[PDB]
Design a protein around this nucleic acid. Sequence first.
DNA 1: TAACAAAAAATTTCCACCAAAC
DNA 2: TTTGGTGGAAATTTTTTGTTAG
Length: 192
Amino acid sequence: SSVLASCPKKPVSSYLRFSKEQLPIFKAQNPDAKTTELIRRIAQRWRELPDSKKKIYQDAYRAEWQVYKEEISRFKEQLTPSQIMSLEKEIMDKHLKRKAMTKKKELTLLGKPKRPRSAYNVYVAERFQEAKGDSPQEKLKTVKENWKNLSDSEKELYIQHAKEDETRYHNEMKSWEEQMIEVGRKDLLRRT
DNA sequence: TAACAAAAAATTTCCACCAAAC
DNA sequence: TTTGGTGGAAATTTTTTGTTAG
């Protein structure tokens, strides 16, 4: 399937090697505590630990790195050019997908207006509740069915609601893009 | 970032149809 | 073209608590 799935993973360095070893010991002694607080406590105990003790985890990491080197080397040597390329592409895709979802999260955090609703959207938003069907997919099928067999006279209401929201969008966007300059985020602005 | 855990919280998905912005 | 919008239940991903180092 995916080259990346069978690709050997990095050995854990000192703190994760400690965290992994400690988490059970802490979870047993505090079973009603959230994982998150146990991790905060485990890190605390890491920070407090002597350098001589820390080094033992490090020494183990370093030794496992040499096994990793060996495994990964052996892995990549056994791969065909086309497999190496899927691996490189799989990694590129991994990055894009991450870059893309964080920008999306950013925009939400900056409260960017929602797109204008189409006449069709306005129709789903009001006809879906009483639609025929069990699953939300089947229910959409009936609202799709009723929308396509609707006359231009009948659509006319949704046309005006979709028109009013197009003005809403225009207005919300004018304010938000203004506010985005005042904070120094003119990158966030539309070209067209 | 990618390495560990692990379950909460956030986001996509499934179906279609539609439109703004690139 | 891509993206995100109408619906919500279920599936799936990201985040939450941390440090390390290639």
